[PDB]
Every structure is written in C-alpha cells, then in structure tokens.
Design an enzyme around this catalytic site. Structure first.
Site, mmCIF file in Angstrom:
data_model
loop_
_atom_site.group_PDB
_atom_site.id
_atom_site.type_symbol
_atom_site.label_atom_id
_atom_site.label_comp_id
_atom_site.label_asym_id
_atom_site.label_seq_id
_atom_site.Cartn_x
_atom_site.Cartn_y
_atom_site.Cartn_z
ATOM 1 N N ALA A 20 0.843 -1.210 0.000
ATOM 2 C CA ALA A 20 0.000 0.000 0.000
ATOM 3 C C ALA A 20 0.888 1.275 0.000
ATOM 4 C CB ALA A 20 -1.038 0.003 1.154
ATOM 5 N N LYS A 44 -3.323 2.959 -2.834
ATOM 6 C CA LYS A 44 -2.874 3.841 -1.768
ATOM 7 C C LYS A 44 -3.972 4.009 -0.728
ATOM 8 C CE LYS A 44 -1.156 6.912 0.803
ATOM 9 N NZ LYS A 44 0.156 6.761 1.480
ATOM 10 N N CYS A 131 -2.722 3.456 11.316
ATOM 11 C CA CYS A 131 -3.227 4.797 11.025
ATOM 12 C C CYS A 131 -3.198 5.654 12.290
ATOM 13 C CB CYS A 131 -4.639 4.773 10.391
ATOM 14 S SG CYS A 131 -5.993 3.999 11.356
ATOM 15 N N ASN A 133 -4.223 7.912 15.308
ATOM 16 C CA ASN A 133 -5.366 8.162 16.146
ATOM 17 C C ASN A 133 -4.960 9.337 17.001
ATOM 18 O OD1 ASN A 133 -7.914 7.639 17.337
ATOM 19 N ND2 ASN A 133 -7.001 6.353 18.943
ATOM 20 N N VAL A 194 4.373 -6.482 7.403
ATOM 21 C CA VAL A 194 4.134 -5.411 8.347
ATOM 22 C C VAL A 194 4.180 -4.100 7.600
ATOM 23 C CG1 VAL A 194 5.060 -6.463 10.438
ATOM 24 C CG2 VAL A 194 6.627 -5.452 8.783
ATOM 25 N N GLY A 251 10.900 -5.538 3.261
ATOM 26 C CA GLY A 251 12.226 -5.784 2.705
ATOM 27 C C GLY A 251 12.397 -6.925 1.717
ATOM 28 N N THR A 273 9.535 -0.642 -0.793
ATOM 29 C CA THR A 273 10.708 0.136 -1.150
ATOM 30 C C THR A 273 11.268 -0.342 -2.458
ATOM 31 O OG1 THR A 273 11.324 0.913 1.058
ATOM 32 C CG2 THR A 273 13.107 0.641 -0.505
#
Ligand SMILES: Cc1cc2nc3c(=O)[nH]c(=O)nc-3n(C[C@H](O)[C@H](O)[C@H](O)COP(=O)(O)O)c2cc1C
Ligand SMILES: Cc1cc2nc3c(=O)[nH]c(=O)nc-3n(C[C@H](O)[C@H](O)[C@H](O)COP(=O)(O)O)c2cc1C
Ligand SMILES: COCOc1ccc2ccc(CCc3c(C(=O)O)[nH]c(=O)[nH]c3=O)cc2c1
Ligand SMILES: COCOc1ccc2ccc(CCc3c(C(=O)O)[nH]c(=O)[nH]c3=O)cc2c1
Lengths: 313, 313
Positions: A20, A44, A131, A133, A194, A251, A273
């Site tokens: 994402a 996205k 996200c 908060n 993750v 990674g 990445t």
C-alpha cells in the site's frame, strides 16, 4: 511448477503484489500496476476527503532502504471507489483497496459504501490500522482498546471478509495481545505484516542534516533494514492465527526474500521500497528468482513450504 | 587534536566503549577491553546468581548485523562486584557495571551493595530496563508503570547518579511518555539508547531453518539494520532530556556511524555487533575515522557538533 494461489475466493497468478502506498495512488499508477505482472494490486491508503499529505522532501531511498512521512496524500475515497467499481479490469488480477481513516467514524462511513462494490465487483478491503489516532496517543495498533473498537465498528459496518494491515511489534506480550484481539473477529480473514518500522531517523553525514522534511526528519522505515522484523511478525501471527491468512510485507528485493516470507507463513507477498526503487518490472524478476529456488529444491507449489520454517532441536 | 571529554565526574580519552553483552562477561574479556583503546568499558549485564544462559546457538552475525537470544549468561553479580572492587585498573579508563536482575527486589539487593563501591571506586551504574518481567507482561521499559516503580526503588536504594539502558521505541507518544518517566528522577544522569531491536527473526534460505536455537529463532537485532532506529532514539531523548546525558548504541561500524550518533546528541558511543565481529582493534579505527571526519569539516571538539543535526526549514 507454479506460483498460482486461490484464496479469499479469488485466483492469483502469483503471490506478488505492491505494498500500500507504492505505485498505486493515481489512475496511472493503478493502470500500470495492472499492466505489470504482479499477482494482485492494492490502492494507496485513502481518507474520506482528498489530501496533499506532508511537505517535501518526504521519501528518500538508500542502499539499505527508505524513510517516509507522506502524511497520507491520496485522491480521496471517492476516486478509489470509482476505480474499484468502474475502471479496474478484474479479469487481469484481483484488486485490493486500502482505507486509512483518521477516526473510527471516518472508517465506518467509507466501508458502508464500499460493501456494495465489494459484494458485486469482488474488490477486497485492507484496513490500515497503522493509522494515526488522536495526537498524543500511539498509532491504533499500539493501542489495543482503539483496535478492538475500530474492528467491532468496521465489522458491523462492512459485514464482509477483509484484512488488516499491522505495524511491527517487538515484544511477545504485544504479539500475544495483538493476535487475541484479531482472533475475536471472524471477518478479518487476512493479516498484513508489516507496515513501516515506525519513527526511524536518517542523518546525512556530509550535510549533517535530516533527509525528510516532516516531523523533524523522523519517519517510517522499510527495505533491507526491516526484513528480519517483518519475518518475525509474519511468523508470530501465522502461528497465533490459524483461521487467518498472513500477507508478508517487509524488505523483499529478491526471490529469496519472498521465499523466506513464504517459509515464515506468507500467502501474498508485497513489495514497497524495492518496487518504489526498481519499478514494476521487478515483479518478473521476483517470480523467476523464486521459481529458480523452488526448482533447485524440487518445490512445485507454494503450499509445499508455506509456514514450513524449521526450528532447531 | 584529541577526543577527550568529561562526563559524570570522569575523564574519558575518547567517547567509544563496548556495548553491554560484548567482550565483557569473563575477567579475560574485561582485561581485554581495559587494554583496548576504548574510552570506557561496561560489564555484561548481571543477575544475583550466575547464569548459564540459553542453549547454543544463541548468537549469529551476518553482513547486515546480528541476532541474539543469549538469555543473560553472566558470572553473577558477586564476580562483577569483585572486578569493580579489587581488579579493574581505574588509571586506564572508567568502568561501568550493568545490572539486569529478574525482579525489582533482585535489583534493589545488588545496588545497595554496589553503592559503597561506587563511592569508594567511582564505578558507574547502567541499569538494564530490557530485563524480565515476566512472562505475560512486556519488558520493564515497554511498561511505563513498572519503569516508574523500578526507578523509584533503585533511586531509593542506590542514591547515587546512575544511568539507564533503554529498548527502542517507535511511536512519538511513547517517546513522550518514556521521557517524562525518566525526567521524574534527578538521579538518572544518563540514558543509553538503544538496546537490541526486540524479536527479529533471521531465516536461512538453504537449510530453510531459523539460525538461533532459543525462542523458535526469535531474538534481538543489532548492527546495520538498527542505526536509524538508534539515531531516532538518541535524538528523541536528547531533545526531551535536557538535564541528562545521552549515550548512543546501535549500528556503529565506522567513524561516520559514530559521527551520526554524536550529531543526534550522543556523548558516549557504544559498539556491540561490530565489536563482536571485528575485535577490539576496532577502537583505533573508529577513533581515526571520526577524527578524520572532524578534521575534514573543521571541528575541534565533540561539543562543537553534538546534538546539532539540522532539520529542514
Ligand atoms: C512511500 C511509502 C508510502 C506508503 N504508504 C502506505 C499506505 O498508504 N498504507 C499502508 O498501509 N502502508 C504504506 N506504506 C508501508 C508499505 O506498504 C510497507 O508496509 C513498508 O514500506 C515496508 O515495505 P518494504 O519494506 O518492502 O518497503 C508505505 C511505504 C512507503 C515507502
Ligand atoms: C551478544 C549480545 C549480547 C548483549 N548483551 C547485552 C546485555 O547483557 N545487556 C544490555 O543492556 N545489552 C546487551 N546487548 C545489547 C547491546 O549492548 C546493544 O544495545 C545492541 O546490540 C545494539 O548495538 P550494536 O548494533 O552495536 O550491536 C547485547 C547485544 C549482543 C549482540
Ligand atoms: C492527522 O495528521 C496526519 O498526518 C500524518 C502524519 C504521519 C503519517 C504517517 C503515516 C500515515 C498513513 C499511511 C502510511 C504512510 C503515509 O501515507 O504517510 N506511510 C507509511 O510508511 N505507512 C503508512 O501506513 C499517515 C500519516 C499522517
Ligand atoms: C527470565 O528468563 C530469562 O530468559 C531470557 C529471555 C530473553 C532475554 C533477552 C534479553 C536478556 C537480557 C540482556 C540482553 C541480552 C541477553 O543476555 O540475551 N541480549 C540483548 O541483545 N540485549 C540485552 O539487554 C535476557 C533474556 C532472558
């Protein structure tokens, strides 16, 4: 000898997808990801209204990975919803759509309206729990009440199969507590481990200066830096959540990297990445490379080794 | 030109020292570090009673760093006290003694006994807050109420200046909370950020096996994986802790890595993975390199650039 998967009642040519936020924000990016040989794509992470995100520079990459505080720039939920329902060619690959609302309310509003498109078109929800908060509290997944809250609320609002996207954890009590929460919720069918490794700091020795402008140069980390952390989380959640799928992210530059994810229990494998740095042409390399490895060992399907990591005597 | 400094009423020849854990468990190790060019040295973290530690293999290094689940092997606090007490040559360099008992009581017992020697000899206390509890609860540091107890109790029992070994944090609110805890205590004269990045998982593609035996392969990470996280924490705690020294640890392999630690606000700079992998010759290299960088930029003292990383705009 193949990479094909069936899950979440969808068929995937391969396990590779973008992460994402990477090459997924615009109709261009999306079309391009679709034209690529990725097995799937994800959009996205979106908020209700369009966003500019943070000031530039906000992403920087290096031999060893990347750092970012984008601040959730995106075209607003309406754009990503019209893309799911009107624009995306599901005959090519499954679409995932990722939502990252700034409150529980904002996230409920979006899923209510997504649900009909999710049902008809088949697009799949990745709720982004890494996200923000309320300022002064930790991001949602680091706050196990807010997380319980967000998931009750979204479950009720959406009433369909969906996955969540987790930040890394580094204590076992955090792994134990986090999975128990997710276990309470039967509609959470996948878990993506993750997200970026939170609040790293990159300093440039020559200029003696931070490399990203926002948050005094503090930002999320990915790439080569985070692979072990990503593999630990995947394997931790794969062990603790046997009625759920783990999606690996962290990674991946090589077939081997993805092979280790899959060994840890990964079903889908996301590139952040590396994709950002190498381009959509990465996906054909990743496939070939994984497949060469499978061949060297006489593995014929992903299921022959997923989660099959060995421990020591 | 030289890198001399004064901290905590001690003179150091340079700002380098081993990290707790590395080259410091046995009396051999300590004689070795004392004979090295290090500015200082720190003892393996100890508990009341000697410990065999975890099954081997429990440590591994690779080109990008290391993973360990040593399980706190040490000769026991009586031996390290004797070394502080009758054996260390204080004319050569300052000694630090690290302490990582299983309970707050275990730590209160050690420090009371350590205070008379600290007064008498000048040895410095680095309390390790990455210790047990429990299981069922996170390490002491990831648990802000226990941290306040441990500090209260040790502060009451030790009653002299001491310092603290911190795990890495990854969220702003934690940095804020953590810092406010340590600021409560005028006795905590220095902070060491950071300890290993908890619970990463290295997998070997060929054997399809984890690499350390304890905890199904899961252990702490150091080395080139953790530098920005270490620099985020050195900087983060330098800003929030204006009456404490910050000591940097994590991912030092070069003069440039140390330079970056100093820029983030480090006074002392620690070496674990590189030291483990290269040997104590590393201290003369690291000295030269840092000294070269300084000369190239026109810096004469560490104080000229400590804490002086630039943000953007
Ligand atoms: C520029 C950038 C933007 C990202 N945007 C999002 C996002 O919008 N939503 C999300 O859940 N994760 C986002 N991520 C996290 C990535 O999807 C991924 O979790 C993380 O970067 C690690 O992937 P990697 O190590 O393979 O790069 C973003 C990462 C980067 C570098
Ligand atoms: C083998 C090994 C043993 C360690 N033992 C301790 C210890 O006893 N106490 C402690 O506070 N930190 C210990 N550490 C953590 C290091 O002191 C340091 O925080 C970490 O490894 C990051 O530094 P590095 O990147 O230079 O390796 C140990 C690290 C390693 C690799
Ligand atoms: C409420 O104020 C909004 O400002 C921010 C500040 C930092 C943010 C960091 C991450 C994100 C969200 C999603 C995301 C982002 C991103 O868009 O910044 N980057 C990542 O590496 N991973 C992510 O999951 C939003 C932020 C918004
Ligand atoms: C109560 O049972 C003790 O078993 C363990 C299990 C994991 C451990 C992890 C770290 C440590 C302590 C000190 C330490 C160690 C270590 O001795 O393993 N390794 C590190 O990378 N950093 C550390 O701070 C002890 C453990 C003991």
């Amino acid at each position: 000898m193949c990479l094909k998967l069936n899950l979440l009642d969808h068929v995937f040519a391969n396990p590779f997808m973008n992460a994402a936020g990477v090459l997924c924000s615009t109709e261009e990016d999306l079309r391009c990801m679709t034209a690529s040989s990725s097995g799937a794509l994800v959009s996205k992470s979106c908020t209700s209204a369009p966003r500019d995100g943070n000031p530039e520079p906000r992403y920087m990459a290096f031999p060893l990975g990347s750092i970012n505080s984008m601040g959730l720039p995106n075209l607003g939920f309406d754009f990503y919803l019209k893309y799911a329902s009107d624009l995306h060619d599901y005959s090519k690959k499954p679409l995932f759509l990722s939502i990252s609302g700034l409150s529980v309310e904002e996230n409920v509003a979006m899923v209510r309206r997504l649900a009909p498109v999710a049902q008809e078109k088949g697009v799949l929800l990745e709720l982004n729990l890494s996200c923000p908060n309320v300022p002064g509290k930790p991001q949602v997944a680091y706050d196990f009440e807010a997380m319980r809250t967000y998931l009750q609320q979204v479950s009720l609002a959406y009433g369909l199969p969906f996955g969540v996207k987790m930040p890394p954890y580094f204590d076992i009590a955090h792994f134990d507590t986090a999975a128990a929460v997710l276990n309470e919720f039967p509609l959470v069918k996948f878990v993506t481990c993750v997200n970026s490794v939170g609040n790293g700091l990159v300093i440039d020795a020559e200029s003696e200066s931070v490399v990203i402008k926002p948050k005094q140069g503090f930002g999320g980390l990915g790439g080569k830096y985070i692979l072990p952390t990503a593999l630990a989380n995947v394997n931790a959640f794969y062990r603790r959540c046997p009625d759920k799928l783990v999606f690996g992210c962290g990674g991946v530059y090589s077939g081997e990297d993805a092979f280790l994810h899959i060994l840890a229990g990964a079903s889908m494998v996301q590139v952040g990445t590396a994709l950002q740095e190498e381009g959509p042409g990465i996906f054909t390399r990743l496939e070939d490379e994984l497949l060469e490895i499978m061949a060297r060992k006489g593995y014929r399907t992903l299921e022959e080794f997923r989660g099959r990591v060995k421990t020591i005597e």
